[PDB]
Amino acid sequence: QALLRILKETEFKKIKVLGSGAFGTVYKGLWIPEGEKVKIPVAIKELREATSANKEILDEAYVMASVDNPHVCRLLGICLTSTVQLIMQLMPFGCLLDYVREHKDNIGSQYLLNWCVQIAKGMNYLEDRRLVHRDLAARNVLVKTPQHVKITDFGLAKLLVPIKWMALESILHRIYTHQSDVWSYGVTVWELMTFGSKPYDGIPASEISSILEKGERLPQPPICTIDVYMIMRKCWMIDADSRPKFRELIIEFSKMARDPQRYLVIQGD
Numbered sequence: 001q002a003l004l005r006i007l008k009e010t011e012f013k014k015i016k017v018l019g020s021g022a023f024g025t026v027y028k029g030l031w032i033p034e035g036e037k038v039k040i041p042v043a044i045k046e047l048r049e050a051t052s053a054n055k056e057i058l059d060e061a062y063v064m065a066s067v068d069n070p071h072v073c074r075l076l077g078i079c080l081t082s083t084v085q086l087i088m089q090l091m092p093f094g095c096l097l098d099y100v101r102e103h104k105d106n107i108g109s110q111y112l113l114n115w116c117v118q119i120a121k122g123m124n125y126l127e128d129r130r131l132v133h134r135d136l137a138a139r140n141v142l143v144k145t146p147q148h149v150k151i152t153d154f155g156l157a158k159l160l161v162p163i164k165w166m167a168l169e170s171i172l173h174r175i176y177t178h179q180s181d182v183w184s185y186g187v188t189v190w191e192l193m194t195f196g197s198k199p200y201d202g203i204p205a206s207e208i209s210s211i212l213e214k215g216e217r218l219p220q221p222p223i224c225t226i227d228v229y230m231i232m233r234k235c236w237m238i239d240a241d242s243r244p245k246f247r248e249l250i251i252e253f254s255k256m257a258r259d260p261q262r263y264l265v266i267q268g269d
């Protein structure tokens, strides 16, 4: 339990709002641990107040605090009052979804393929721990530096619907496995390769199941060669066991990262 710090209310201060939504509020703030001589920049995520067991909350937070990988965000500390407040390291460049949209003209093939490797490394770490993420998406990848991204919000779903990132078996039967995480990974890569386009844009969530049942899939991004699109398509196979494994995705995307211009055709790159 020494991985999870229980923070007093005086030990952290919210300074600036970073974002707000149905989940709650995320702040940029300071962590001032008592009996220490340092003030640490952190993000503070205050979940929306709920009418619903503390023992199971701490137990899940202990798991979130136990993740130890350069490409998965760790839970630094927690503060339980009428609300749940999660403290973690501040990722100054924000979410990868906003980043690829803001830098669509200045992102080369090497950055994109390196991100695919790092996301697959983080997800493979979780699979080795027998942990399922359930909400992998570009909005849930954070940018520590342009060459270092981390998967965020692990365990938050269990602590508490992204239809367009979900595998068909998850939509129809609410089944979540590592192989359904692979489907979400495929959609995430598609978000990256389109510089942040919305998947199935304008299509209501209730229609997605019938799109997948008919055999339709997200279209090939303009910059993607057929080798990269084949990986995305394999992530979206109906048979979950036929999808790639995260360990295989690391190998194949690391191979492409060694000659990135061969696999992504980007103007000016």
Ligand SMILES: *CCC(=O)N[C@@H]1CN(c2nc(Nc3cn(C)nc3OC)c3ncn(C)c3n2)C[C@H]1F
Pocket: 018, 019, 020, 025, 026, 028, 043, 045, 088, 089, 090, 091, 092, 093, 094, 095, 096, 097, 098, 138, 139, 140, 142, 152
């Ligand atoms: C794209 C998804 C999204 O917009 N999420 C918002 C922002 N969130 C968030 N942001 C950061 N870093 C950051 C973002 N901005 C605009 N400035 C900074 O730092 C200066 C972050 N670091 C750690 N964690 C958990 C973060 N979350 C979540 C939504 F509010």
